[PDB]
Structure formats: structure tokens, C-alpha cells
């Protein structure tokens, strides 16, 4: 599971 | 328009003292930072923009610049720990927490996302987010009669960010924070969205990864039956965390392990122990090993659910990592089991696949196997039947392997190997 997420849209 | 601006131009617009020129440049920064191919996070930080972006979070009369700056800061904070720290050091935690109450749901959601990135850096930033008071307002966004009235994406982000507030160790989250979050978390775990269910299970998995008192906080909220249901899901992103959580709970007390058994978890292990995903098989066998370390009446329930043939199967053919957990599960079974339980193992075919693994390299598995063989022989004696087992071990070519084990670096192997050849 991802610790961090970039918002791309 | 706001596409492909230079950092130079972003800086000119943000420094212009015209709020509308600052907005266009912040948008242009947001689009640069939105790029999947190496976003220029470090260039933006070096240009000195974080403190301006943080001040823009507070411009209640210009909600579009609140949104754009929240999005740019979310994506700076999505980077390395140094990049997240730049965001924290600019004052962004209290400013994002104030935005949780924004009447604009897209802005509230962006603040949820940023606080998730910040808390996901590690336990110190997680705890700093908690100390600034983030839990009360996050939980208030979820205090609705029916979760289904919220937008799907908003619910998923809120769940994901709550899961990061449950995550990490050294230290584990503060106890009062966990108690405050759990009731809402248990509601999300009964929701119908697969991404919400998966992230809820990951959160429970984090909370049960610790001492038996952490497990108990969770178990006492009644989640084990829902975990067992989820353990049977079709979607592997749900099974994987459901299984981690169940596996964590059975590292606890015999009574906590019994809650898992009572809820029906053993009936799912025929599928789990044959699952085509190697990681599921492996985690399922590991969980079995902490159940066969339980009481004899718990071992008996393993037997009753028909799981001993499934462990034989894994020993016979599986990934080598899975086979080793199977060896552990068997050694624990032989160590705690009754004589009747132990002989049943031989009737199910355990010997031949055990021996064929003695030809492995990892010295540990040999020690685990040899401990099981010894425990089995000791059960044979109690029945007066050691010769019959000795023959078995011979007709499958076990002795051959056992003898050569005396020729092993870890003299413990050499010690046990020889001792068995002796008495039998």
C-alpha cells in the first residue's frame, strides 16, 4: 500500500 | 495557457502582488507538479514558493487559489521525506487542518489528501499531524448516517488518509488516537466500495501489528467476523490486507486466536492455501503456523476443518518460502499436539514431502524438519511403533538424507541428525 500519492488529475 | 510555464515566470507572477496573477502562476506550478515524468519538485522548492503557497491556503475569498496551492503542496509533499519536510516547515499542517472545514468539498478533499501525504512520511509527522488536532475534523467529515451519500472519491481519500494515521511503528500511534478513530474505521470496513474496504483492512492490519494490547483494542470492537468475510473476497487487493490482519491477530493470545477460529476463518484456508498468488499462499501458511502453535483444542479444529492435507500439499509443491512456513507450521503442530494428532500427520502423508526438503540449503528448515521428525518419533514410541516409522523414512529415502546431514556446517544439524540415526 502506497505511503504517498501524487495527484495527476 | 497555464501550460509549460518556466519556474522563472511562476516566480514573477507569484511575486506580483496581484491576486489574480498569483492564481495563474500557482495553477501553472500545479500543472508542472502534476506531471508523472519527474515533476520539478526541487526546482519549485528552491525558488522559494512553499511559503507563498502556504499563505494562499488562507485566502478564503479566493477559493481557486486555496485549491491550486493545496494541490501544488500535496504534490510537493508526495515526494521524498526532505520534500515533505519542506512543506511541513512552511507551516502547512495547521493551514491544511483549517481547510478540512471548507464549504468547498474539492478543497476539503485536497487538504485530506495533503495531510495523508504528510502523515505517510512516518511516525513523527503522523504524530505532529495528530497533535495539531487533525482527527476531530477528519472524523466529522465521516459522521453521516449512511456513508453512501458521500462522493466515492472523497470517501476513498478520507479512508486512505485515516489509514496513514494508523500506520507505522516506533512508536505506534497514540493509544487515545486509535480509540478515537476505531468506531469510524469499523464503519468503513463494512462499506461496499472495494477501494475503501481494502484501505480499511490495511488500517486494521496496521493496528493489529503490535503487542497483544493493541490487538485487543481491535478484537474487542467486533471486527473479526467482517475480516473473515473479507478474507473470502474475490478481489485480491481486499484478501491481501484482510489476511495480513487475521495473521496479525493470531500472533496474540490463544483467546484472540480463538475469536478467529470461532468466526469461521479455517473454512477459508482450503482456498487460501491453494491460492494462485504466491504471497497469499505464503501468508496463509504463516498464519497456519501461529494457529498450530495454539492449544490442542485449536489444533483439533485445524484437523477437523481438513487442513492437514492442505499443509501436506504445500510441503509437496509450493514456492520455497511457502514450504518453509509449512515446515514451521508442522513443527509447531508436532510440538503441541496430542499423540493422536501427531500420528494423523503421518496418515495424511507428511513424511515423504518432509524428507524431500532435507535436501535443501537453508540450515533453519533442516533444524525445523528434524525437530518435527523427532517429535513424531517420540509419539511413535508412546505407541510402540518406532520401527514402522523408521521403515517409512527408509523407503522414502529419508535416512540417506538424514545421514548426510551429519556433514553440515551447523553442528546442531550434525548433532540432531546423528542422534536420530542412533536411537532409531
B235 φ, ψ to 5°?
A: -75, 120
Q: Distance from CA of residue B400 to its chain's centroid?
A: 42
Cβ distance of B199 and A1 shorter than 8 Å: yes
Distance CA B194, CA B260 (A): 23
Cell 546431514 sits on residue: B405
Q: Is B384 left (phi over 0), alpha (psi -120 to 50) or beta?
A: left
Residue B273 belongs to domain spanning: 1-424
Report the number of distinct structural domains present in chain B: 1
**What is the sign of the dihedral through the CA atoms of B98, B104, B105 and B111?**
negative
Query: How many angstroms separate the Cα of B117 from the Cα of each of B140, B317, B367?
Result: 20, 41, 44
| SS3 per-residue string spanning B43-98 | HHHHCCCHHHHHHHHCCCCCHHHHHHHHHHHHHHHCCCHHHHHHHHHCCHHHHHHH
Q: Residue B240's closest chain A neighbor by CA? A: A1
Is residue B44 a contact partner of residue B82, using CB atoms and an 8 Å limit? Answer: no
Which cell goes with B244?
495480513
Hey, what's the torsion of the CAs at B340, B301, B231, B155, to 10 degrees? -140
Contact B160 A5 (CB under 8 A): yes
Contacts of A1 in chain B (CB under 8 A): 163, 199, 202, 241
**For testing the chain A interface, which of B32, B39, B78, B109 should be mutated: the one with the most A CBs within 10 Å?**
B78
Helix (H) or strand (E) holding B117: helix B105-119
DSSP H helical segments within B208-350, as ranges? 212-219, 224-230, 236-249, 254-262, 269-272, 278-291, 296-304, 308-316, 320-336, 339-347
Residue B251's nearest CA partner among B216, B204, B223, B291 is: B291
Burial-class residue B323 by CB neighbours within 10 Å (0-12, 13-18, 19+): buried
**Greatest pairwise CA separation for chain A in angstroms:** 20
Rounded to whole angstroms, the Cα distance separating B205 from B238 reads: 12
Return left, alpha or beta for B172; rule: phi > 0 is left, psi -120 to 50 is alpha, else beta. beta
**Residue B116, Cβ neighbours under 10 Å: how many?**
27
Spatial distance between the Cα atoms of B265 and B226, rounded to a whole number of angstroms: 10
CB within 8 Å: B34 and A4? no
Among candidates B36, B120, B241 on the partner chain, residue whose Cβ is nearest the Cβ of A3: B120
Location of C-alpha cell 491477530 = B249
What CATH number has the domain bearing residue B38?
1.25.10.10
How many helices and strands (H and E) does chain B possess? 28, 0
With CB atoms and an 8 Å threshold, state whether B34 touches A7: yes
Phi, psi of B76 (to 5 degrees): -60, -45
Q: How many residues does chain A have?
A: 9
The sign of the dihedral angle between the CA atoms of B267, B221, B286, B340 is negative
Contacts of A4 in chain B (CB under 8 A): 77-79, 84, 116-117, 120-121
**B241 CB near a chain A CB, below 8 Å?**
yes
Q: With CA atoms as reference, report the closest residue to B346 among B328, B326, B330.
A: B330
Nearest Cβ partner of B78 from A1, A5, A9? Answer: A5
How far is Cα B135 from Cα B187, in angstroms, rounded to an integer?
A: 16
Please name the residues between 1 and 9 in chain A that touch chain B, using a CB distance below 8 Å: 1-9
Mutate to test the interface with B, among A2, A3, A9 (most CBs of B within 10 A): A3
The resolution in Å comes to: 2.0
Q: Do B78 and A8 touch (CB under 8 A)?
A: no
Under 8 Å between Cβ of B259 and B284: no
Distant-in-sequence, close-in-space partners of B91: CB < 8 Å, separation ≥ 6: B51, B54
Pairwise CA distance, residues B411 & B363, whole Å: 10
User: Is B74 in the A-facing interface, judged by CB distances under 8 Å?
Assistant: yes
Cell of B192: 461496499
Structure determined via: X-ray
C-alpha distances in Å from residue B398, one per residue of B85, B286, B313, B352, B394 = 59, 25, 18, 8, 5
d(CA B424, CA B401): 15
Chains A and B: how many Cβ contacts under 8 Å?
A: 39
Q: How far apart are CA B255 and CA B29, in angstroms?
A: 55
Q: How far is CA B128 from CA B54, B75, B89, B115, B206, in A?
A: 17, 19, 12, 11, 19
B338/A contact by beta carbon, under 8 A: no
State the cell numbers at B204.
486494521
- Cell readout for B148 is 453512501
Residue linked to cell 485449536: B298
Let me know the angle formed at the C-alpha of B222 by B195 and B259, rounded to the nearest 5 degrees: 110
- With contacts defined as CB-CB under 8 Å, which chain A residues touch B83? none
d(CA B197, CA B152): 12
Cβ neighbours of B121 (radius 10 Å): 25
Amino acid at each position: 500500500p502506497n505511503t504517498k500519492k501524487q495527484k495527476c488529475g | 495557457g497555464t501550460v509549460n510555464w518556466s519556474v522563472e515566470d511562476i516566480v514573477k507572477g507569484i511575486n506580483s502582488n496581484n491576486l489574480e496573477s498569483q492564481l495563474q502562476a500557482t495553477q501553472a506550478a500545479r500543472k508542472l507538479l502534476s506531471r508523472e515524468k519527474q515533476p520539478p519538485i526541487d526546482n519549485i522548492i528552491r525558488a522559494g514558493l512553499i511559503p507563498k503557497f502556504v499563505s494562499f491556503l488562507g485566502k478564503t475569498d479566493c477559493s481557486p487559489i486555496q485549491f491550486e496551492s493545496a494541490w501544488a503542496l500535496t504534490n510537493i509533499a508526495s515526494g521524498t521525506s526532505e520534500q515533505t519536510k519542506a512543506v511541513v516547515d512552511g507551516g502547512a499542517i495547521p493551514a491544511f487542518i483549517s481547510l478540512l472545514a471548507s464549504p468547498h468539498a474539492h478543497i476539503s478533499e485536497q487538504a485530506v489528501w495533503a495531510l495523508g501525504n504528510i502523515a505517510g512520511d512516518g511516525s513523527a509527522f503522523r504524530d505532529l499531524v495528530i497533535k495539531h488536532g487533525a482527527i476531530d475534523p477528519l472524523l466529522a467529515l465521516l459522521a453521516v448516517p449512511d456513508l453512501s451519500t458521500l462522493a466515492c472519491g472523497y470517501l476513498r481519500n478520507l479512508t486512505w488518509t485515516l489509514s496513514n494515521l494508523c500506520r507505522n511503528k516506533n512508536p505506534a500511534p497514540p493509544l487515545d488516537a486509535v480509540e478515537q478513530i476505531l468506531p469510524t474505521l469499523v464503519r468503513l470496513l463494512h462499506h461496499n466500495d472495494p477501494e475503501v474496504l481494502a484501505d480499511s483492512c490495511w488500517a486494521i492490519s496496521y493496528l493489529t501489528d503490535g503487542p497483544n494490547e493493541r490487538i485487543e483494542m481491535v478484537v474487542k470492537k467486533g471486527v473479526v467476523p467482517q475480516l473473515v468475510k473479507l478474507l473470502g473476497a474475490t478481489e485480491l487487493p481486499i484478501v491481501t490486507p484482510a489476511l495480513r490482519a487475521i495473521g496479525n491477530i493470531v500472533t496474540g493470545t490463544d483467546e484472540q486466536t480463538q475469536k478467529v477460529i470461532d468466526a469461521g476463518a479455517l473454512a477459508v484456508f482450503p482456498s487460501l492455501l491453494t491460492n494462485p498468488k504466491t504471497n497469499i499462499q505464503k501468508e496463509a501458511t504463516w498464519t497456519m503456523s501461529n494457529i498450530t502453535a495454539g492449544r490442542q483444542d485449536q489444533i483439533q479444529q485445524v484437523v477437523n476443518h481438513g487442513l492437514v492435507p492442505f499443509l501436506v500439499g504445500v510441503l509437496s509443491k509450493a514456492d520455497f518460502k511457502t514450504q518453509k512456513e509449512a515446515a514451521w507450521a508442522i513443527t509447531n503442530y508436532t510440538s503441541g499436539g496430542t499423540v493422536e494428532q501427531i500420528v494423523y500427520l503421518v496418515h495424511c502423508g507428511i513424511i515423504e514431502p518432509l524428507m524431500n526438503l532435507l535436501s535443501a540449503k537453508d540450515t533453519k528448515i533442516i533444524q525445523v524438519i528434524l525437530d518435527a521428525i523427532s517429535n513424531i518419533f517420540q509419539a511413535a514410541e508412546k505407541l510402540g511403533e518406532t520401527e514402522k516409522l523408521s521403515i517409512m523414512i527408509e523407503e522414502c529415502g529419508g535416512l540417506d538424507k538424514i545421514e548426510a546431514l551429519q556433514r553440515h556446517e551447523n553442528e546442531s544439524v550434525y548433532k540432531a541428525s546423528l542422534n536420530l540415526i542412533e536411537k532409531y
